[PDB]
């Protein structure tokens, strides 16, 4: 369904309630596991947001969890919101190629935005970025 | 309302089994349920019959019989599972799509009613319910998720509990659709604008969905503009601005218009090239002739680039100069100025200016009002003649009245005609009477 609405629909009001909800965490030393794209495997900075963009939906909706009807539970609801915008933009084929993180709350924060981020800035130098095939970046894993 | 025979709720058969389903009405009735394979349908003038040799689970679903003709007659409802086996789920749809805070009805049909107490809906890869998923179940129908959201448009499984393991069905698409009223809700700023040969227009859309369009063209060729986009209030935004740092060939026609699968919306505006400009008009004759205790506005339309840095009315009158301040105006590039000038006194009448100024220059329109003048006699003997006088604007007449007789005497050999003053006519006891559009006059001698 891919279409030239690929840009224009991460905005800049997303990447806000991110860093807010970012700014509102208590800084801690404490870990928590979760799984993500290993860089390693996937120096392609494109072939790495698509995998990435797939493992962060799982990430909000088992680690991201806030307070019903708090601003951040509201921000989260937008991102997952927009995550299904972005389907359709994504093209995929046949798990794995990923690695188990061992990091605090802020760090995987830092690499959800991050993934936003980059999204919407190769988005904006072209829209049909995301529709290559990285069936063949997948198999060096 | 029709009956069917079985009278039961539900059935459930094998593969290759005998069904038949009868439905009698007063008036010719008719079957409706799953589109599926060999059905055998008889039906004469108040009754009609399904029936299959070899049934299979295609054929498991409601069936539903209505008698056409009778009109809030109501329906008569069976449901047919046909257990193919290990298998407790019939999907009839691997894809559903719905509105927000619609009902959204998962078709999976299940094939043993006594399972209904150990059933669940889940998503795939073994993944939890949204968040405050509102949803319920019906045998016959499959999952209902209750007044569905657009985050809940996602790939979903029915659970069975068979022998401690939990089988799934084939995998639900639910698609949830935003409720988009129509095209995307413009905004040309400004409506109206015209300057000397800088200027800012901004083409703006914006919809609870991304996927619209928006264009800004001058005339109709459409101009390539940069638009920013931003999403915010739950709503995304495409703003296309125009910067002229200007001239003739910039003024124009300025379409902004905006499409999306509902459908295409058009807003526009108007753009004019003049150097700085200061235009002074009025409705009304700068002569102006009124009754004394009349009242009178005096009115001057003002169309000037860029805004007026200063403007007044002044009284050139004769009498004695008491200014105005009497001074209202309405409407910025459209200016009207209104002197009030209510229950006019005699030293109120001669010039009054307007005068406005801007970086054009200054200008100016002067109104002359002269107030009426009524009749007045002047009669003379000389030499045996006499000689009578009457005075006003318009050109009156003159009756003479000897009161036994009258003579009349409608435009007279003219004594003045000049630019503002009174029209003095020349007549050669004696009632002389003087009537114009004015008034009445008289003397006697």
Redesign the interface.
């Known amino acids: 369904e891919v279409s030239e609405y690929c840009s224009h629909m991460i905005g800049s009001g997303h990447l806000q309630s991110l860093q807010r909800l970012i700014d509102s965490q208590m800084e801690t030393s404490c870990q928590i596991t979760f799984e993500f794209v290993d860089q390693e495997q996937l120096k392609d900075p494109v072939c790495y947001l698509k995998k990435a963009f797939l493992l962060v939906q799982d990430i909000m909706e088992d680690t991201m969890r806030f307070r019903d009807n708090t601003p951040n539970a509201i921000a989260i609801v937008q991102l997952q919101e927009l995550s299904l915008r972005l389907k359709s933009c994504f093209t995929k084929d046949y798990k794995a190629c990923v690695r188990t993180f061992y990091e605090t709350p802020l760090q995987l924060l830092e690499k959800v935005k991050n993934v936003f981020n980059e999204t919407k800035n190769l988005l904006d130098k072209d829209w049909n970025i995301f529709s290559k095939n990285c069936n063949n970046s997948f198999a060096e894993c | 309302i029709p009956v069917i025979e079985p009278s039961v709720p539900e059935l459930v058969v094998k593969p290759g089994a005998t069904v038949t389903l009868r439905c009698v009405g007063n008036g010719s009735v008719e079957w409706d349920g799953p589109p599926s394979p060999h059905w055998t349908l008889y039906s004469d003038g108040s009754s009609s019959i399904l029936s299959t040799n070899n049934a299979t689970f295609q054929n498991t679903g409601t069936y539903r019989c209505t008698e056409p003709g009778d009109p809030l007659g109501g329906s008569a409802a069976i449901h047919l599972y046909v257990k193919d086996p290990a298998r407790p789920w019939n999907v009839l749809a691997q894809e559903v799509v719905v509105f927000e805070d619609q009902d959204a009805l998962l078709p999976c049909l299940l094939t043993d009613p006594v399972l209904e107490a150990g059933v669940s809906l889940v998503r795939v890869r073994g993944?939890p319910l949204?968040r405050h998923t509102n949803y319920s179940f019906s045998p016959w129908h499959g999952f209902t998720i209750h007044r569905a959201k657009?985050?809940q448009?996602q790939d979903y499984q029915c659970s069975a509990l068979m022998g401690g393991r939990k089988v799934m069905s084939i995998s639900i698409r639910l698609k949830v659709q935003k409720v988009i009223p129509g095209p995307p809700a413009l905004t040309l700023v400004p409506a109206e604008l015209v300057r000397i040969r800088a200027a800012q227009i901004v083409c703006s859309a914006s919809s609870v969905?991304?996927?619209?369009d928006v264009f800004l063209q001058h005339n109709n060729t459409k101009l390539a503009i940069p638009?920013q986009?931003?999403?915010?209030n739950?709503r995304?935004?495409?703003v296309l601005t125009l910067n002229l740092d200007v001239d003739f060939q910039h003024a124009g026609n300025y379409s902004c218009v905006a499409s999306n699968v509902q459908g295409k919306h058009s807003t526009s505006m108007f753009f004019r090239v003049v150097s700085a400009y200061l235009n002074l008009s009025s409705e009304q004759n700068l002569i102006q002739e009124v009754t004394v205790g009349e009242g009178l506005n005096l009115k001057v339309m003002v169309e000037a680039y860029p805004g007026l840095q200063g403007f007044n009315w002044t009284y050139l009158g004769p009498f004695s100069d008491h200014q105005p301040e009497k001074l209202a105006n309405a409407t910025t590039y459209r200016h009207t100025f209104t002197l009030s000038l209510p229950r006019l006194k005699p030293s109120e009448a001669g010039r009054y200016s307007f005068l406005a100024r801007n970086p054009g220059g200054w200008r100016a329109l002067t109104f002359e009002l002269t107030l009426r003048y009524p009749p007045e006699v002047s009669v003379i003997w000389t030499f045996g003649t006499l000689l009578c006088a009457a005075s006003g604007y318009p050109q009156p007449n003159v009756t003479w009245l000897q009161c036994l007789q009258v003579w009349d005497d409608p435009y007279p050999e003219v004594l003045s005609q000049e630019p503002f003053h009174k029209v003095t006519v020349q007549s050669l006891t004696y009632e002389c009477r003087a009537h114009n559009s004015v008034g009445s006059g008289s003397w006697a001698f």
Do not use: E
């Not at chain 2, 969905?209 to 619209?212: R, S």
């Not at chain 2, 986009?229 to 915010?232: Q, V």
């Open positions: 993944r949204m657009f985050i448009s969905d991304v996927n619209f638009q986009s931003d999403f915010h739950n995304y935004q495409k």
